[PDB]
Swiss-Prot record, chain C:
InterPro entries: Complex_I_Subunit_2, NADH_DH_su2_C, NADH_UbQ_OxRdtase_chain2, ND/Mrp_TM
Gene Ontology process terms (BP): mitochondrial electron transport, NADH to ubiquinone; mitochondrial respiratory chain complex I assembly; reactive oxygen species metabolic process
Descriptive protein name: NADH-ubiquinone oxidoreductase chain 2
Subcellular location: Mitochondrion inner membrane
GO terms assigned for molecular function: NADH dehydrogenase (ubiquinone) activity
Keyword Nucleotide-binding annotated: no
Membrane-topology descriptor: Multi-pass membrane protein
Catalytic activity, reaction form: a ubiquinone + NADH + 5 H(+)(in) = a ubiquinol + NAD(+) + 4 H(+)(out)
Alphabetized UniProt keyword annotations: Electron transport, Membrane, Mitochondrion, Mitochondrion inner membrane, NAD, Respiratory chain, Translocase, Transmembrane, Transmembrane helix, Transport, Ubiquinone
Length: 107, 121, 347, 70, 459, 54, 140, 53, 56
């Protein structure tokens, strides 16, 4: 059996390279220190500073397009009106029955 | 809708004369822009297959790709609009000429329509 | 052969197809079919080897039997009504004879057995011609007489073709046989919408021709006829393999690729006619075609197969001959879904 | 400030929705009518669509035919 | 809506015209800016919707998903920067192109006023994910995984298309507004039962449903980190969004047809939580946890009550964020140990204390610790189920207990105990990994301050 | 983990489909290339087609 | 041809079991004869005697399947007193699957065949009830 | 499909041979010429569906 | 340096340009949906003396 046991021509599996070895203060972004530092800076500025803080403040101060206070004020004046006139607060019918035409059964 | 046998159809006209009574598509039509984009993509792929700098190998050839695609797309859009206009015209004429097959529904309000209610529990 | 003779034979094939397409007399349609068959054989036998001769003789036997059946249908139709014009047949028996003749000419199941063998025997350019240009005339005749066809028989053959193509492609390592089974499945898709809308038939035909042209030209460019030969292309032309993978994805019917346009439309059309079960089965069966397309993509561009040492020499040379329309074919076969309503042009 | 510089009033979205709904409802009723019209034309064949060719009568020869009885 | 779509498209020429060593920086910066711009969709109305045009519309169900989709891309780029170092510029540009195309398809899918357009984009998302899995995955099983992730999906999605076109042939439209306003009851018929099944099964397979979940562990385990992040965070939510949209035409047939799926989900959450207790792989454990959470979301959508829908929306957002964080932590361990076996690298608290804190907070959010939005969704769904039937409380509480058990088991196995002696290549955590972890976790604890942003249209 | 997830759920949907498609593909694509059998099937199909429809 | 279809369908579903079994047996036998013809054409095994034996086995298997389906389905419809129920058809399909398994002597195919045949039978009954069209005429 | 080149160009390549009653040489009359002429004149322009019914 | 860093940083300007183009296209598409402007029963409003359209 003169076979080589080498099934094919293959490069050996390379060993993983440490970014801290050639460069302490390596930030884990790139092996080029300048590109590494600027990648860290842009990620931190546009992620933590711009989006995370300014966007959160923008969401906090969004105008009331859901009309929560509007509904509260409408309910307040409506309850004030019905309590003053003795009306039974909320009605059980959502629509007026006079304007609904039921089908006569005659069963 | 088979329109091959539609009366008064000249056999091999891409665009009949009556199609000239329709508004032509604008040159800034999004479909024309997509045709030009397809021409640009064809030019880039042609550069890539020939092992040439993909973005900046032949500007004359890429321009020709874009222009031919836009030209054919313009004429194709004209024909497409004409065919859809014919479909609508024939549909409306047929509805007009056969009133008994398209009777008017009596307009009825939801106040006197009884819909069965199904609770979600 | 001589380039003059080759050009003459190609134009004779095209003139036969044209004769079939422009004539109104059944005799002239039969003559166009005869002319096409007569000029097609040397094209299949352009490169001489025993396999090409076997493919040509099988193709001739099939097409001549189909032509005789078609002439029988014509004569029976003349017997029951002295008409020569291509229109509704007027005879139930004649229509069946005509349908079987055209199914044999197209390669629809159960008359599919010749397509894989003929495609494997002939070269890649001959296969491109056979799978693209040789479907126009029978499909045009079918479109002309679509109001006559029995929907049961046509739909049975369409579903059988889709099933047979899907199952037969799963077992192939040869690229030409894969193309043949794909063509059988696509013919099955095309003929299932003839009873309802010939415009959808023509749209499917155009999309399929575009994709088949792109795939064959890519296979000719990277001169491979087997899976393992194609697995070497990434080590010389990776961009060709990427384009081939995108084209294969399109051929499997994935949105938003161009190959999704026909089936979708066809399904949509078949739903307007209260046909629900049949399109469902057709899509489920097309999943098989997608499976073997995906296997080819895995073997070609999504993984890197081992190469050989002599490939290094091939790194020093570039193609002398180029296809001008290959980029346009790729783009038209991958990126025309947004332009779907243009099908109103009655393509 | 945010509402003034980034957004608009409820009227714009309200009336845009009105217009969009009107267009879409018209398209739906047009599609249904078109399907019904196709069904009727294919059933009866009295419309411009689904017109299948018949023999042209200009091909007939109207002449004496060597025999009085045609 | 074009003010978000066009910049995402411009991400492609910018990526392909960039320097060889500026692709990550430019992609990250401009994706973050696109996320910031998309953040202004959160200003929703109490009335109908944000109907931009005939093609695209926004809703308070769509807006949180859109914002999460836009926020996920920068994190995916940061996670992918490490393991793509030794690869050519063209291939890295192709990888970033696949991510950008996935984001574009997801953005157009979530707005998608048309149901056929929604289907087309919802299936177009399939291609980039498959290419990412089967091209940049490590093990030999990835190809097989891809096949599963493909065919399952199509096996569910092909009938839906037929159903969809059928509806437009009867209704006349597939616009969601017209469908909602012109909706009509479904009679109890065999044809209607099969229409219901064709409408539901496509979204059920991608949640995934318990019986139909086989593709998920393979696809998530064999995918690269960006692929796993996008699969767990956004792609699983397509089924929930589609069900929430499509259940409007399925009433009242949902009352009867929901029972087998409700039983499957209620038992499968227990089954998958129990499976998590015996798992030798971190990624598989996280995948099964995702299956359990999505089973709870399926129950919520099937009950179809307001509290159910609010809980399901909140849980979808919270699960996306938490699962992305967990996958990132697992990948940080893997890139050091190269094994992905949970029992191998032990006692990492003594060597990586800040990463141990990140592990703890991720496990806490997965455990649904109040007042996190995870527990907000959990509790809303549980209360809705209790109103649906009081006996669901046993299964829900058992699921909660097992969830806490396997989350703390995962934390204790990897972080506590004694370090493995023979492993000496555990390097200090990079600033990139810590920044990634913070960018996952701060949005969760900051969303717990404003829950109405992620509670959906029925708030 | 094993009985249901790794065995029976695999056996039911994916493995069964793969097995059935495998067997059907083997049956379909296994023709020896003899045109005698092909045209015998052609006669059979042609004969069956004429009789069943009419 | 459709003559056997009409012979089977004309008999009321809940009555007169023996003719339903006979008709289903004939339909199965015809299907098996067609299958045997195709199998002989594509695969001529060795000779005339083995070929006629293979035709006999295929035809008898298919006829037994049809007989069991018809008998079990009609008996189920009769005893349950509920016609127009797909469950009866499903039971018949399951019975047919069981018979097929016995012929092939396989527990797996018998079980697999029973489940698949029953589902198919149930679907055919639902199509009869709802008017589903496998081959739709050109309407539009 | 059918490209009606003859109608567009007015060529009459093969229409002279399609029906019995179309200008036979020496005015020879077909046996069924009277019947075919009536059928053609009935069905002209009406369309195939209406012609058949 | 001008004319030098432009050849290295030209790509950065593209995303911002896209955002502006998308805003412009959104407004242009808004201009095609004015069939009911100042016509809804809820917001039938009589125009101000120096007003052309209620909203743009
Ligand atoms: C949704 C719609 C919106 C988005 C549209 C998306 C599509 C758009 C483009 C379509 C096609 C056009 C380009 C294709 C030609 C190929 C080019 C190429 O190969 O790349 C190299 C080339 C750079 O390399 P190079 O140094 O020149 O030459 C080296 C070789 O070329 C290459 O070096 P190599 O060959 O030695 O490297 C080998 C490599 C090379 O092989 C390739 O990469 C081939 C490329 C893939 C083929 C694409 C098929 C056709 C397109 C259909 C896409 C389907 C999309 C649907 C969704 C499904 C997704 C698949 O092959 C591999 O590595 C194989 C393994 C890879 C994994 C499997 C492959 C995945 C394929 C999926 C790709 C899909 C997205 C592609 C994006 C464009 C890629 C450049 O790339 C480019 O520069 C072209 C990019 C486009 C230029 C944009 C210019 C505009 C910018 C300025 C103007 C601003 C505009 C706005 C106006 C306002 C401003 C003020
Ligand atoms: C309680 C009031 C607090 C008020 C002070 C303000 C605190 C603000 C914190 C904001 C969130 C922290 C950011 C997360 C990443 C941590 C950063 C880090 O690595 O530390 C480096 C830094 C330097 O240490 P090092 O020596 O360099 O690192 C060594 C190792 O890392 C070893 O480090 P280690 O061993 O020291 O561990 C780090 C520490 C930090 O890591 C964590 O685990 C923090 C995350 C825990 C939450 C897990 C998710 C569950 C959902 C809760 C959502 C609450 C958020 C509320 C809104 C927040 C707005 C963003 O973990 C713990 O100590 C475990 C604490 C377990 C607390 C569980 C109780 C939760 C519910 C409490 C009530 C909340 C609602 C109250 C409603 C009624 C009253 C109004 O260490 C710290 O500064 C510690 C952080 C502060 C401790 C947080 C504990 C309570 C805060 C809860 C959130 C805010 C409450 C709002 C109510 C105010 C009234
Ligand atoms: C997504 C939602 C959640 C889903 C959860 C998962 C659900 C699916 C997983 C569970 C599926 C359970 C059933 C799977 C199929 C079992 C049969 C099979 O696979 O055959 C392979 C296999 C093929 O035969 P073979 O491998 O050539 O025979 C060698 C055996 O060792 C030779 O066996 P032997 O001769 O020793 O057996 C003697 C005797 C077995 O009798 C006994 O010993 C126990 C009697 C009680 O035979 C019989 O009883 C046959 C009746 O048959 C067997 O080996 C086992 C045969 C016994 C099966 C008993 C019945 C099993 C339960 C059936 C009921 C459940 C499904 C019924 C559906 C009907 C309507 C749709
Ligand atoms: C997949 C992309 C395929 C593209 C097709 C090739 C593109 C190059 C073609 C070059 C120009 C073609 C125009 C031909 C000039 C004259 C046309 C004239 O002769 O024909 C007319 C009609 O021409 C064609 O119908 C129009 C062809 C246009 C095809 C485009 C539609 C494809 C579907 C949309 C996909 C997107 C493609 C656009 C991107 C390029 C009249 O035909 P008619 O004698 O009366 O009846 C025959 C047809 N019947 C039987 C069906 C009724
Ligand atoms: C305390 C006070 C500040 C509160 C916080 C506010 C911060 C807001 C930031 C978040 C903004 C969210 C998106 C808002 C814009 C949405 C898109 C568009 O609508 O806005 C356009 C305006 O957008 C701006 O022009 C662009 C905003 C871009 C913000 C980028 C911030 C981060 C940049 C960081 C760069 C740092 C320098 C580089 C360092 C390396 C104008 O909209 P328009 O179509 O008219 O609307 C129609 C209705 N109108 C007519 C009434 C308006
Ligand atoms: C290190 C040790 C600690 C040091 C630091 C000590 C200080 C701690 C104080 C901070 C935490 C304590 C909690 C106290 C909260 C105070 C602020 C809070 O009250 O404001 C909230 C306001 O904040 C917002 O509501 C929550 C922020 C929104 C988060 C958006 C996420 C950012 C985008 C990132 C991408 C998205 C990824 C996830 C996709 C879904 C709620 O206010 P609200 O009563 O309601 O109304 C706001 C004011 N109004 C009345 C004028 C309207
Ligand atoms: C595997 C992993 C999970 C995948 C997804 C699983 C979820 C799918 C479950 C399907 C939902 C229910 C399907 C049918 C529900 C109808 C109600 C039925 O179950 O109850 C009886 C139905 O009776 C019987 O079921 C008749 C059918 C019998 C045949 C069915 C086969 C039985 C087992 C098949 C299960 C296999 C599923 C997978 C297939 C590949 C009531 O009878 P009846 O009141 O009179 O008629 C009600 C229906 N009507 C009103 C429209 C007329
Ligand atoms: C009726 C026809 C219906 C058609 C449905 C098609 C569904 C798509 C899957 C088809 C698989 C066909 C291929 C096959 O099974 O071959 C066995 C093949 C052999 O491996 P090869 O790749 O060929 O060789 C490589 C090593 N030498 O085995 C496999 O690899 C299987 C891997 C993919 C499994 C994917 C399973 C997906 C199905 C999930 C359930 C739903 C199925 C679809 C129908 C749903 C039910 C209505
Ligand atoms: C993960 C893999 C799952 C694979 C797919 C699962 C979903 C299966 C759902 C059914 C598929 C096709 C359904 C049809 C699509 C809807 C169309 C529709 O509703 O129209 C019906 C048509 O209904 C049908 O035709 C249904 C026939 C179904 C045939 C295919 C059966 C597939 C398997 C059946 C058993 C399993 C069913 C549920 C499986 C769930 C997934 C496990 C009524 O229309 P008409 O008939 O024209 O009007 C009535 C008057 N004539």
């Amino acid at each position: 059996p003169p076979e080589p046991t080498i099934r094919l021509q293959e490069d050996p599996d390379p060993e993983d390279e440490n970014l801290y070895e050639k460069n302490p203060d390596s930030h884990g972004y790139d092996k080029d220190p300048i590109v590494d530092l600027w990648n860290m800076r842009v990620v931190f500025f546009f992620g933590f500073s711009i989006v995370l803080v300014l966007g959160s403040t923008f969401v906090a101060y969004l105008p009331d397009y859901r009309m929560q206070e509007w509904a509260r004020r409408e309910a307040e004046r409506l309850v004030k009106y019905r309590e003053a006139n003795g009306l039974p607060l909320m009605e059980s019918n959502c629509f007026d029955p006079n304007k609904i035409q039921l089908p006569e059964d005659e069963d | 809708t088979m329109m091959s046998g539609r009366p008064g159809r000249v056999p091999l006209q891409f665009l009949p004369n009556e199609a000239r009574s329709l508004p032509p598509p604008k040159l800034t039509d999004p479909r024309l822009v997509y045709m030009g984009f397809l021409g640009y993509c064809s030019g880039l792929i042609d550069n890539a297959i020939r092992r040439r700098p993909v973005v900046s190998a032949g500007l004359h050839r890429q321009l020709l790709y874009v222009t031919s695609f836009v030209f054919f797309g313009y004429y194709l859009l004209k024909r497409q609009d004409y065919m859809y206009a014919l479909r609508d015209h024939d549909m409306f004429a047929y509805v007009k000429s056969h009133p008994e097959d398209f009777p008017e529904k009596d307009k009825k309000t939801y106040g006197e329509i009884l819909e069965e209610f199904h609770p979600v529990r | 052969m001589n380039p003059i003779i080759y050009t003459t034979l190609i134009m004779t094939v095209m003139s036969g197809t044209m004769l079939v397409m422009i004539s109104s007399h059944w005799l002239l349609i039969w003559i166009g079919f005869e002319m096409n068959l007569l000029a097609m054989i040397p094209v299949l036998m352009k490169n001489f080897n025993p396999r090409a001769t076997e493919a040509a003789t099988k193709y001739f036997l099939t097409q001549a039997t189909a032509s005789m059946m078609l002439m029988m249908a014509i004569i029976i139709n003349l017997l029951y009504s002295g008409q020569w014009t291509i229109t509704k047949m007027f005879n139930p028996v004649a229509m069946t004879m005509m349908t079987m003749a055209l199914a044999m000419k197209l390669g629809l199941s159960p008359f599919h057995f010749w397509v894989p063998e003929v495609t494997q025997g002939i070269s890649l350019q001959a296969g491109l011609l056979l799978l693209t240009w040789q479907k126009l005339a029978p499909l045009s005749v079918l479109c002309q007489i679509s109001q006559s066809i029995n929907p049961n028989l046509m739909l049975t053959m369409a579903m059988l073709s889709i099933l047979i193509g899907g199952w037969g492609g799963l077992n192939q390592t040869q690229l030409r046989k894969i193309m043949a089974y794909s063509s059988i499945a696509h013919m099955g898709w095309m003929t299932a919408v003839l009873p309802y809308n010939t415009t959808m038939t023509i749209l499917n035909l155009l999309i399929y021709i575009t994709m088949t042209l792109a795939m064959f030209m890519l296979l000719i460019h990277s001169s491979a006829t087997t899976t393992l030969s194609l697995s070497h292309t990434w080590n010389k032309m990776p961009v060709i393999t990427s384009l081939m993978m995108v084209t294969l994805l399109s051929m499997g019917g994935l949105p938003p690729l161009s190959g999704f346009m026909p089936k979708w439309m066809i399904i949509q059309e078949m739903t307007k006619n209260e046909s629900i079960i049949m399109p469902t089965l057709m899509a489920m069966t097309a999943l098989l075609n997608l499976y073997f397309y995906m296997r080819l993509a895995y073997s070609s561009s999504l993984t890197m197969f081992p190469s050989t040492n002599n490939m290094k020499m091939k790194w020093q040379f570039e193609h002398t001959k180029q296809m001008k329309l290959l980029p346009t074919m790729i783009v038209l076969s991958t990126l025309v879904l947004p332009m779907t309503p243009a099908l109103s042009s009655l393509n | 400030w945010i509402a003034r510089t980034f957004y608009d009033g409820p009227e714009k979205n309200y009336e845009k929705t009105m217009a969009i709904l009107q267009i879409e409802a018209e398209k739906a009723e047009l599609r249904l009518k078109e399907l019904e019209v196709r069904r009727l034309m294919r059933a009866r064949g009295d419309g411009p669509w689904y017109q299948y060719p018949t023999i042209d009568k200009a091909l007939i020869d109207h002449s004496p035919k060597t025999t009085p009885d045609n | 809506m074009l003010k978000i779509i066009i910049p995402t498209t411009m991400l492609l020429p910018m990526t392909w015209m960039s320097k060889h060593n500026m692709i990550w920086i430019n992609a990250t910066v401009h994706s973050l800016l696109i996320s910031l711009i998309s953040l202004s969709l959160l200003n929703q109305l109490g009335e109908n919707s944000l109907n931009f045009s005939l093609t695209f519309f926004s809703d308070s169900l769509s807006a949180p998903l859109l914002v999460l989709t836009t926020w996920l891309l920068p994190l995916m780029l940061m996670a992918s920067q490490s393991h793509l170092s030794k690869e050519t510029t063209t291939r890295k540009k192709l990888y970033i192109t696949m991510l950008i195309l996935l984001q574009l398809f997801l953005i157009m899918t979530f707005t998608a006023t048309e149901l056929i357009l929604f289907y087309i984009l919802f299936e177009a998302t399939l291609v980039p994910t498959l290419i990412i899995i089967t091209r940049w995955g490590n093990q030999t099983e990835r190809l097989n995984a891809g096949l599963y992730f493909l065919f399952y999906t199509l096996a569910g999605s092909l009938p839906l298309l037929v159903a969809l076109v059928y509806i437009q042939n009867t209704t006349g439209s597939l616009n969601f507004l017209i469908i909602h306003y012109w909706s009509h009851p479904l009679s109890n018929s065999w044809s209607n039962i099969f229409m219901w099944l064709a409408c539901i099964m496509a979204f059920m397979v991608k949640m995934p449903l318990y019986g139909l979940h086989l593709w998920l562990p393979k696809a998530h385990v064999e995918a690269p980190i960006a692929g796993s992040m996008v699969l767990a965070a956004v792609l699983l939510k397509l089924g929930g969004y589609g069900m929430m949209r499509i259940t409007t035409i399925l009433n009242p047939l949902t009352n009867y047809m929901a029972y087998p799926f409700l039983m499957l989900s209620m038992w499968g959450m227990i089954m998958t939580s129990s499976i998590c207790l015996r798992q030798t792989d971190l990624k598989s454990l996280i995948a099964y946890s995702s299956v359990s959470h999505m089973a709870l979301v399926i129950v919520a959508i099937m009950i179809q009550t307001p509290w159910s829908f609010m809980g399901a929306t909140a849980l979808m957002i919270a699960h996306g964020l938490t699962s992305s964080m967990l996958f990132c932590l697992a990948n940080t361990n893997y890139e050091r140990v190269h094994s992905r076996t949970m029992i191998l690298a032990r006692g990492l608290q003594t060597l990586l204390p800040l990463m141990a804190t990140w592990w703890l907070v991720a496990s806490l959010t997965n455990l649904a610790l109040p007042p996190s939005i995870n527990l907000i969704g959990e509790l809303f769904i549980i209360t809705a189920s209790f109103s649906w039937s009081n006996i669901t409380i046993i299964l829900m509480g058992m699921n909660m207990m097992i969830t806490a058990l396997y989350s703390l088991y995962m934390l204790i196995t990897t972080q506590r105990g004694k370090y493995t002696h023979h492993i000496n290549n555990i390097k200090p955590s990079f600033t990139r990994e810590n920044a990634l972890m913070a960018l996952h976790i701060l949005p969760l604890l900051l969303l717990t301050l404003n829950p109405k942003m992620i509670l959906g249209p029925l708030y | 983990s094993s009985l249901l997830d790794l065995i029976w759920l695999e056996t039911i949907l994916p493995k069964t489909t793969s097995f059935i498609q495998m067997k059907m593909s083997i049956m379909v694509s296994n023709q020896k290339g003899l045109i005698k059998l092909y045209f015998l099937s052609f006669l059979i199909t042609i004969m069956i087609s004429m009789t069943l429809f009419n | 041809a459709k003559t056997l279809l009409h012979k089977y369908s004309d008999i009321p579903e809940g009555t007169e079991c023996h003719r339903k079994a006979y008709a289903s047996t004939s339909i199965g036998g015809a299907t098996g004869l067609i299958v045997s013809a195709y199998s002989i054409a594509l695969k001529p095994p060795a000779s005339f005697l083995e070929g006629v034996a293979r035709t006999g086995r295929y035809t008898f298997t298919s006829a037994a399947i049809g007989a069991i389906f018809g008998l079990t389905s009609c008996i189920s419809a009769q005893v349950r007193e509920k016609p127009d129920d797909p469950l009866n058809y499903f039971i018949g399909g399951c019975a047919g699957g069981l018979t097929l398994g016995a012929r092939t002597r396989s527990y797996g195919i018998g079980a697999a065949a029973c489940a698949y045949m029953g589902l198919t039978a149930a679907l055919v009954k639902m199509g009869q009830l709802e008017g589903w069209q496998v081959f739709a005429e050109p309407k539009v | 499909p059918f490209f009606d080149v003859q109608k567009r160009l007015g060529l009459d390549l093969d229409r002279w041979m399609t029906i019995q009653s179309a200008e036979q040489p020496h005015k020879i009359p077909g046996r069924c010429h009277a019947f075919e002429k009536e059928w053609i004149e009935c069905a002209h322009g009406i369309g195939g569906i209406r012609a058949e019914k | 340096n001008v004319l030098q860093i432009v050849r290295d940083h030209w790509v950065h300007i593209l995303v911002p340009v896209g955002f502006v183009f998308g805003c412009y296209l959104d407004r242009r598409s808004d201009e095609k949906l004015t069939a009911f402007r100042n016509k809804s029963l809820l917001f039938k409003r009589e125009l101000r003396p120096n007003e052309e359209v209620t909203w743009k």
